[PDB]
Every structure is written in C-alpha cells, then in structure tokens.
C-alpha cells in the first residue's frame, strides 16, 4: 500500500546520489594539473 | 560549457526516458493508468492559485531587477568620462521599475480573489471552483513572464541609450521612443491578466 512512497524514496535518492557521483567524478576526471615538471 | 552540459544532459535523459515510458503505456494496454483527469482534478485548486499569486510578483521583479543592472552598469560605465548622463538617464531605470509596479498591483488583485472552502471531493469542488484554480495560475504566468520579458527589453535598449547619450546629448530623446514600445508589452500582460480573472469567483 505504500508503493507511492517507496518508489520515490528510491528514485529521487538514487538519481540524486548518481548526479552527485557524476558531478564529482567529472571534476576529478579532469582537474588541470601543473604537469610540465 | 561545463555546467550547461549538466542541464543539457538532464533535459535529454529526462525526456528520453519519457519517450520509452510513453511507448510502454500505450503498447500494453495501460493508457487508462495515465489519467490527466486525475492529475488536474485530485491535487488542489490552491496549488495552482497560490503559485500564480507568487509567480505574479516574483517573476515580474526578476525582469525588473534584470533590466536595472543591464543599464545601471552602462550608467556608471559611460558616466566616468561623461557625468551628465546620471540625472537624464534615470528614466530608463523607472521604465524597468514600472514593470515591478504592474507586478505588485496585479499581485494584490489576484490575491484578493482567493477564498477557502470546505469541500474535498472533485465533484463537490465544482467546475466553478477548479476553474478558479487554473485562472489564477494562468493570470500569474501572463503577468509574470510578460513583465520579465519586457523588463529585459527596456533594460537592453536602456543600456544602448545610456551609451549613445555619452557620445551625443541630443540623441537620448529620440531613442526614448523605443523604450515606450518596449514598456507597452508590460501593459499588454496586465490587460490579459485582468481579463482571465474578471469573471472568476473562488469560494464556497
């Protein structure tokens, strides 16, 4: 009976957690080092 | 573009999956599960109304503040060499201050027509009362976004009139004609806003 609750408790957390995971992983994927030395 | 790639990615992935979710409701039999009737009727006629009252004042002063700093940076920028601008060209600021006035006047107009009721059923809450919800929403959008767009309009031409006035003082009176046509879009929104809510009546 709590199907509206449990569906969005998974969904908006998981795509809220994956959006944090892609934003971070992007920022660190390229980070502009000083690589000449 | 780094931050735009997020919004370009969210807008694609959201629709894209609407499409696959859209061709999987029809393809089984499950179009009865969609129910735009249950969306528009069950939720509230207070949500549509009080959003439109909030969007009337707030989206109008978004374009009113937007129109200021486009030309207010042009006032102080061109005014360093030519300080005669500052008193003559403040009428461009008032022409994007009137669009906030049109917002707040329509906001207290649309807020007065909201009245609480007791019914909770979509049949007990009649079609005179759900139309009261949607009309306050659409009036808030047509006075909120219209004052936003004409707020940018009189600000952009106000910035150009502030810079031609630095070169030649005799030009600003002629370019001021263009801001009158730009500010007429704001009054055009308030006309439709009071026509969508002229016949409406909320309450029970």
């Amino acid at each position: 009976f709590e199907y509206p609750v449990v569906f969005n408790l998974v969904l908006w957390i998981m795509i809220g957690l994956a959006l944090t995971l892609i934003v971070t992983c992007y920022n660190i994927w390229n980070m502009d080092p000083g690589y000449d030395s | 573009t780094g931050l735009v790639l997020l919004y370009s990615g969210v807008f694609v992935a959201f629709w894209a999956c609407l499409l696959v979710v859209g061709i999987c409701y029809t393809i089984f039999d499950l179009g009865f599960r969609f129910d735009v009737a249950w969306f528009l009727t069950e939720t509230s006629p207070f949500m549509w109304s009080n959003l439109g009252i909030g969007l009337a004042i707030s989206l109008s002063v978004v374009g009113a503040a937007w129109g200021i700093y486009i030309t207010g940076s042009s006032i102080i920028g061109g005014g360093v060499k030519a300080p005669r601008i500052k008193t003559k060209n403040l009428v461009s600021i008032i022409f994007c201050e009137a669009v906030a006035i049109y917002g707040i006047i329509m906001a207290i107009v649309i807020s007065n027509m909201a009245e609480p009721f007791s019914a909770t059923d979509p049949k007990a809450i009649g079609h005179r009362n759900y139309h009261a919800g949607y009309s306050m929403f659409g009036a808030g959008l047509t006075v909120g976004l219209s004052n936003l767009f004409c707020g940018v309009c009189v600000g952009i031409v106000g910035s150009g009139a502030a810079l031609a006035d630095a070169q030649n003082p005799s030009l600003f009176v002629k370019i001021l004609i263009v801001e009158i046509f730009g500010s007429a879009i704001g009054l055009f929104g308030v006309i439709v806003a009071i026509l969508q809510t002229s016949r409406v009546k909320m309450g029970d």
Binding site: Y3, P4, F7 | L3, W38, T43, S44, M47
Partner: protein, 39 residues
Amino acid sequence: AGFFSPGIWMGLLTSLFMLFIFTYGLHMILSLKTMDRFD
C-alpha cells in the same frame, strides 16, 4: 498502486519547481570569479 498519489505529486511539483529557482541562483553564484591583478 499509484506511482504518484496526489500528495507526493503536489510536493514534487512544488519542489522540482523551486529546484529550478535554486539551480538558477546557484549558477549565477558559481560564475562571479575574482580579478587576477590589482592597481
């Protein structure tokens, strides 16, 4: 069963509307970068 029954479907339409306001206010803040040098 109801993927969205009306109350979550009102709170989502309220939150995801003012999340468009918050990410708009954040996008303006994320670009107010400082100067390089002084005189």
